[PDB]
Design a protein around this ligand. Structure first.
Ligand SMILES: CC(C)(C)c1ccc(C(=O)NCc2ccc(-c3ncnc4[nH]ccc34)cc2)cc1
Length: 267
């Protein structure tokens, strides 16, 4: 099958990290091309369902989405083969103060993500866990969105339950926390939090609160406030993502227009 990579074509070279599905390694495909290789730990994934969806994800192709190259499914553990991103996860990248980012670079990271999410929205495809930890950075400083949709195949109830200890409370709108109502507009809410992460250089949202306290405050209408590095116009964009009413939040196409307008006005 066109989605199937022969694992004998992989050369494993370095460890990259560990996530919800286990260890991820850096390697080469056919001795030449850089790849990341997720080694799916036994019992962590609804594997048959993922394999069917892998066909759909294969045809999601955008310059700002981390590309799915294929899967290795004829052995266990199965492998997911993706685009390699030399500079790793966006969250850690933001927290490296040596970069001494200009605010123009921060806005370009937001635009990179927003372009990927506009593409996903045009395909009616939800990320479901958009956040700085699920964005990666390549050798040119381009940010790309990673592991989109994969939350549907996580078997860990601590991650999937809204009261679960691993659930992304701090990236979730009130209707998700209250009713598990997921939609394009919960992706929009999370994108606003991601913009805040970027302009806060990777601070934890609601950093002095627990998850339980965050959920209560968000329901009462509390919001994140303006990062020091965000202009008023940039703050207006991220804040528009957090309307209590989901139908009042923008689309990613509107967010992209707004971000491009601010790039013109500030640079
Ligand atoms: C819950 C959810 C959203 C479904 C989910 C979230 C994360 C993971 C995951 O696998 N996280 C670990 C991880 C991911 C990517 C890379 C990586 N990929 C490419 N190039 C790279 N360069 C440096 C690192 C690196 C490394 C490690 C799985 C699932």
């Amino acid at each position: 099958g066109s989605w199937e990579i022969d694992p004998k074509d992989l050369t494993f070279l370095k460890e990259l990290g560990t996530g919800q599905f286990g260890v991820v390694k850096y390697g080469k495909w056919r001795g030449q091309y850089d790849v990341a290789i997720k080694m799916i730990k036994e019992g962590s994934m609804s594997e048959d369902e993922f394999i069917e969806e892998a066909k759909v994800m294969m045809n999601l192709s955008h310059e700002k989405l981390v590309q799915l190259y294929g899967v290795c499914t004829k052995q266990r553990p199965i492998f997911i083969i993706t685009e390699y991103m030399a500079n790793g996860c966006l969250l850690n990248y933001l927290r490296e103060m040596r970069h001494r980012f200009q605010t123009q670079q921060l806005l370009e990271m937001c635009k990179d993500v927003c372009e990927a999410m506009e593409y996903l929205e045009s395909k009616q495809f939800l990320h479901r866990d958009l956040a700085a930890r699920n964005c990666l950075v390549n050798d040119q400083g381009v940010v790309k969105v990673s592991d989109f949709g994969l939350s549907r195949y996580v078997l860990d109830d601590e991650y999937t339950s809204s009261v679960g200890s691993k659930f992304p409370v701090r990236w979730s709108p009130p209707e998700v926390l209250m009713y598990s109502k997921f939609s394009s507009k919960s992706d929009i809410w999370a994108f606003g939090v991601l913009m805040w992460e970027i302009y806060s250089l990777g601070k934890m949202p609601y950093e002095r609160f627990t998850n339980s306290e965050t959920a209560e405050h968000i329901a009462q209408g509390l919001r994140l406030y303006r990062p020091h590095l965000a202009s008023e116009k940039v703050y207006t964009i991220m804040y528009s993502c957090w309307h209590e009413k989901a139908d009042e939040r923008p689309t990613f196409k509107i967010l992209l227009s707004n971000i491009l307008d601010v790039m013109d006005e500030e640079s």
